[PDB]
Structures are given as structure tokens and as C-alpha cells.
Design a protein around this ligand. Structure first.
Ligand SMILES: COc1ccc(Nc2ncc3c(n2)n([C@H]2CC[C@H](O)CC2)c(=O)n3C)c(C)c1
Length: 304
């Protein structure tokens, strides 16, 4: 899967599985107070559309928001998956580096999940456009900020025993001040038409971002998200190159990663940042750093 999930842990303790419980009606917002605009993206069974929400929250704000909803192809299972994502977001609480839940419309029509709108789009496209500019250029401080902001969002999910399962620059969004935010985009992102999601039976998996234990054993842990985060750092510090450049996803690829092959240091990564990627890429999951350890070390690189 490529959706967020709450797991059990015996640091942080899982008392409840929010997906297995009813929805908290405190998030209910009137659907007629939404004015829809353009579609931001769509998956096989869901889509995300920009909207203006009129009188949303404590401050009765009028703001641009992102609204998730089902497509015509969706049945009971897809409706459950959207409700499940809504239940997870209501449980986790707010964080500055997460695409926060703002409201929901679960009555009087199709289910709508209202979240923060990220005005600058995805990080991957942003890096690519900045890298190719003919002419404010990116600085190392900007790249360190993106890296730190994602690590803080990931340390927040880990503290809540929540696994991400699709860490990648395409899944990092940039909001006001070019601040990075992560979110669960599995239901609304275009997986079917993106060749980075490899056909593996009935699943489509982002194989170049996955930890060896995830591709081979279907094991997903906070440590497997750490591996993907190392791939994301490589994307940030190469300014958006495709991982394992020019290497096709086939049997030789799986053999290379199984055998400990690692991508070369990217062009804009200082040696200390490359050392974080190498640590994320330890074959033994317990030898990888935690997201809190990454946050602490990134803070040292920003200061010095
Ligand atoms: C390409 O142009 C882009 C991309 C993203 C945004 N902003 C954005 N804000 C909030 C979002 C969001 N997108 N999405 C998806 C959209 C498809 C994308 O592939 C993944 C993220 C969400 O699910 N929420 C909650 C914009 C304004 C332009």
C-alpha cells in the first residue's frame, strides 16, 4: 500500500486504531460554503480539487483549500478508504509540516475531506524548474530547510506510530513561505499513469524509493520510511533527478539493491548530507537512524 497507517508498538503506544472507530462530527463543514475550482490531481478512485471555503474554523476565514472526494469508479471499499484517511487525520492532530485536516462534509451528499491547500505545488517539479531556470536561485539553506521540514513531519508521524509508505519528492508539497508539508496523497495522486509506480501483480509500487525489506518481504515500518527519506534527500540534493539515473527497474535492479548498491553523492550535497543518505540506506533496518536523530543532525548542518 501507499497510504498512511497506524501500527502497534511495544516510546509511543497505540491505544486505539482510529480507522476502526466512528468519525468525529466536530469536523463537519457545510458543503454549500465551498466553491469549487480546478482539479489538482486524481487517482483511480479519488480526486483533489481546489476550492474557496467560506467561514471555515475558529477565525471564520475565507480561504483556498484542497478538497478530496471520490470519482464515479468508487464503490464501498473506496468510500471506506477515504473515511479511514479522514479518521487518521482527525486522530493525529496538527503539525506545521503536515497537510492539516480542516473539515469534512460527510452528510447531504458525497463525502468531502477538506485539507490545507499548498500554493507552490510539489517539491519535485519545484526543484526541476529552479534547476533549469535561464536567469531567486536556490541556496544550500533552502535545501537544508526542505530536508529539515520533511524530517520534522516524519518525526511527528513516527511519534504517533504512523507509517507513511510513499516518501518521495513528488509527495512533498510547498506552501506559503515555500514551507514543506507531507500528507497522505495515495487516493488522489495519479499512480496509474506514472511509470515510477511499477506493476507488481495487482499493485503499483514506487520501487526506486522502497527499502529492500518492503519490496521483497512487504514489511513496512518507521525504518522503511527512513530508507525512502534517504532517497528523497538524494532527489533534493540532485535538484530533482530520477533515482538510480538511467537504470531500469528489472531483475538486475533488485539484485543491485539487495547486494548493497547505493547511488553516488548528488552534485549539491555536502559530504555530511550524503552521510545521512548512506545511514538511511543501511541494509539492516535497526542500523538506520531515527527521524529524531536526522532532525538533530540536520539542525547542526544548518547552524554550522
Ligand atoms: C501539480 O500541481 C500542483 C500540485 C499540488 C498542488 N497543491 C496541493 N495542495 C493540497 C493538496 C494537493 N496539492 N494534493 C495532491 C494533488 C496532486 C499531486 O500530485 C499530489 C498532491 C492533495 O491531495 N492535497 C490535499 C498544487 C496547487 C498544484
Amino acid at each position: 500500500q501507499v497510504r498512511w497507517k497506524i501500527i502497534e508498538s511495544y516510546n509511543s503506544y497505540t491505544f486505539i486504531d482510529p480507522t476502526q472507530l466512528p468519525y468525529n462530527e466536530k469536523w463537519e463543514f457545510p458543503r454549500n460554503n465551498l466553491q469549487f475550482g480546478k482539479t489538482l490531481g486524481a487517482g483511480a478512485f479519488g480526486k483533489v480539487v481546489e476550492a474557496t471555503a467560506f467561514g471555515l474554523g475558529k477565525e471564520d476565514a475565507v480561504l483556498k483549500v484542497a478538497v478530496k472526494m471520490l470519482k464515479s469508479t468508487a464503490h464501498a471499499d473506496e468510500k471506506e478508504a477515504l473515511m479511514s484517511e479522514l479518521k487518521i487525520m482527525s486522530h493525529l492532530g496538527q503539525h506545521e509540516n503536515i497537510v492539516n485536516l480542516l473539515g469534512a462534509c460527510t452528510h447531504g451528499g458525497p463525502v468531502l475531506v477538506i485539507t490545507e491547500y499548498c500554493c507552490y505545488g510539489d517539491l519535485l517539479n519545484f526543484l526541476r524548474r529552479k534547476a533549469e531556470a535561464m536567469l531567486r536561485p536556490l541556496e544550500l539553506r533552502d535545501l537544508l530547510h526542505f530536508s529539515s521540514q520533511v524530517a520534522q513531519g516524519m518525526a511527528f508521524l513516527a511519534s504517533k506510530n504512523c507509517i507513511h509508505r510513499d516518501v518521495a519528492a513528488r509527495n512533498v508539497l510547498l506552501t506559503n513561505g515555500h514551507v514543506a508539508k507531507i500528507g497522505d496523497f495515495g487516493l488522489a495522486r495519479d499512480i496509474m499513469n506514472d511509470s515510477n509506480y511499477i506493476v507488481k501483480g495487482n499493485a503499483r509500487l514506487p520501487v526506486k524509493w522502497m527499502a529492500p525489506e518492503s519490496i521483497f518481504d512487504c514489511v513496512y515500518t518507521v525504518q522503511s520510511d527512513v530508507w525512502s527519506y534517504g532517497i528523497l534527500l538524494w532527489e533534493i540534493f540532485s535538484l530533482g533527478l530520477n533515482p538510480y539515473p538511467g537504470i531500469l527497474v528489472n531483475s538486475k535492479f533488485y539484485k543491485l539493491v539487495k547486494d548493497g548498491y547505493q547511488m553516488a553523492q548528488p552534485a549539491f550535497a555536502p559530504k555530511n548530507i550524503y552521510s545521512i543518505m548512506q545511514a538511511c540506506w543501511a541494509l539492516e533496518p535497526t542500523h538506520r537512524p531515527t527521524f529524531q536523530q536526522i532532525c538533530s543532525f540536520l539542525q547542526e548542518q544548518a547552524q554550522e
